[PDB]
Amino acid sequence: GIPCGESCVYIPCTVTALLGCSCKDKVCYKN
Structure with a gap:
């Protein structure tokens, strides 16, 4: 859920x- 930016x-x-x-969603999130 945390937007990692990249x-x-x-x-x-x-x-x-x-x-x-x-x-x-084409964004990398960590949980």
């Missing part, structure tokens, strides 16, 4: 992927 527009999130953020 979004998955064209490619998957890479920096927030390290934070444990998931691609949801």
